[PDB]
């Protein structure tokens, strides 16, 4: 068992850490009264949205190749063509929103009631509400769905989950891969996801008031301070 102290990483944001090995029954947290409470989940959702995508087949695999429309939108990064996999990676929102309008109303609401996905309201539209809007998730949330996403125990095909799974690995060393996906907007920073070091997972989120590569940086110092990353050597 790790003794986790985190409060040197928060001293300038107001923030919460949650962290579980999977074996553990119970989560270990930093700031609860954070932890519990709901909060747009922004490129967070990618991760839900692509297991719905894949599953309903409004995108056939990770490297499903959607075209630039021409438009040219704020982030130089957008303005090409991108596939699930990389659309996750460079967290290229006009992608998922493609795919959420071919998911659809219907599907999206059963499916985000289906793994207990926050308060999981989708009113604030099809291609929206992940963003700033209606859809609300905790952190303790966000480590329970996770926490299932990496055992496999959500109703996606299994064949689903693992193609998102790799599709969120974020770094790979010599002894543990990470898994994540960040967050930003309205001053809600996400870092979610999960690192598996040699025979254990945590899977973990930090939520801030700031931003999601604060979160991530967070994220990276506290698994570093415990030896689950390794130093940048």
Do not use: C
């Not at 009631?113 to 009113?123: C, E, F, Q, W």
């Not at 480590?143 to 299994?158: A, C, G, I, W």
């Amino acid at each position: 068992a790790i003794a986790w102290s985190v409060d040197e990483f928060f001293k300038n944001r107001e923030g919460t850490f949650v962290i579980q090995e999977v074996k553990e029954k119970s989560p270990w947290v930093y700031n609860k009264k954070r932890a519990k409470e709901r909060f747009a989940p922004q490129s967070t959702f990618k991760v839900a949205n692509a297991l719905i995508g894949l599953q309903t087949g409004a995108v056939r695999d990770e490297y499903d190749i959607k075209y630039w429309d021409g438009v040219k939108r704020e982030i130089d990064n957008w303005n090409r063509d991108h596939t699930l996999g990389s659309g996750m990676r460079d967290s290229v929102v006009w992608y998922y929103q493609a795919m959420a309008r071919d998911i659809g109303e219907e599907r999206m609401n059963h499916w985000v009631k289906a793994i207990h996905y926050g308060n999981k309201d989708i009113s604030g539209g099809i291609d929206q509400f992940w963003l700033s809007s209606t859809l609300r998730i905790s952190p303790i949330e966000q480590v329970r769905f996770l926490k299932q996403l990496y055992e496999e125990t959500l109703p996606f095909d299994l064949k689903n989950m693992r193609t998102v799974k790799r599709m969120m690995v974020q770094e790979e060393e010599k002894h543990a891969t990470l898994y994540g996906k960040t967050g930003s907007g309205s001053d809600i920073g996400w870092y979610v996801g999960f690192i598996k070091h040699e025979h254990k997972t945590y899977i973990l989120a930090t939520n801030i008031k700031g931003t999601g590569i604060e979160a991530k940086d967070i994220t990276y110092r506290i698994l570093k301070k415990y030896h689950l990353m390794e130093a940048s050597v």
